[PDB]
Structure 1
């Protein structure tokens, strides 16, 4: 599924991401925009052979099992395929673990390079929340 901006903000809010570990909803929407262009089905292979999955580009080295990332972990205890669902529940639950891990939202390279320090409130402007 390719979400609209305000449609994703509403789903993220419902699933408890607004202010999760102090990160406003606009941070999460901005991250999803630059990681996946709001596409749940997005996949991107990494130089290390790991793959990033879903609306928040969650990596198979640490977070999910895809059966093709040797000596990786599955710290979210999910098949990476669960992260490509139209239902964002599994991505949001795994993203909560990731952002609690010590480097916060810097775990998302698109968030650090394109969202961090910017007017991220703009990403929820005009949305009924």
Structure 2
């Protein structure tokens, strides 16, 4: 599915991301916009043989297992395929683990480059 902005904000809020580990909701909405364009089925292959999966583009070298990535660590203990569901539960649960790992939201390249340092509250304005 392709979420609307406020629709995703509300779902992310129900799943406990607002202010999670120090990151207000607009961070998570901005990250999804620029990672997946709000599409739960987005996928992107990388040079190291990994793939990024789903609404938050979770990576198969470190976080989810896709069975085809060298050096897999599966730190979210989840098949990557579950991260392509239209239900965001598995992606949120893994995102919570990622953002707790010690480098905050910097794991999300698009957030780091395109959201961090901007007024991210604008992403929930009008919702």
TM class by smaller structure: over 0.9
What is the CA–CA distance in structure 2 between the aligned matches of 1:8 and 1:123, rounded to whole Å?
Answer: 10
Alignment partners' CA distance in 2, 1:103 and 1:46: 21
**Secondary structure, in 3 states, of the residue corresponding to 1:44?**
strand
Deviations, residues 88-112 of structure 1 (Å, cap 9, x unaligned):
0000000000000011001101001
* CA distance in 2 between partners of 1:95 and 1:24 (Å): 14
Q: Which residue in the other structure is 2:56 paired with? A: 56
Shift of 1:71: 2.5
CA distance in 2, matches of 1:70, 1:45: 13
Deviations 1:60-99 (A, max 9, x none): 0011111101221111111101001010000000000000
The structure 1 segments of at least 4 consecutive aligned residues displaced by more than 4 Å after TM superposition are none
Query: How many residues are matched?
Result: 127
Q: Distance in 1 between matches of 2:28 and 2:100?
A: 14
TM-score, structure 2 as length reference: 0.99
What TM-score comes out, normalization by structure 1 length?
Answer: 0.97
Three-state SS of the structure 1 residue aligned to 2:118 is coil
The CA RMSD over aligned residues, in Å, is 0.5
CA distance in 2, matches of 1:9, 1:58: 18
Q: Distance in 2 between matches of 1:120 and 1:25?
A: 8
Structure 1 gap segments, 5+ residues each: none
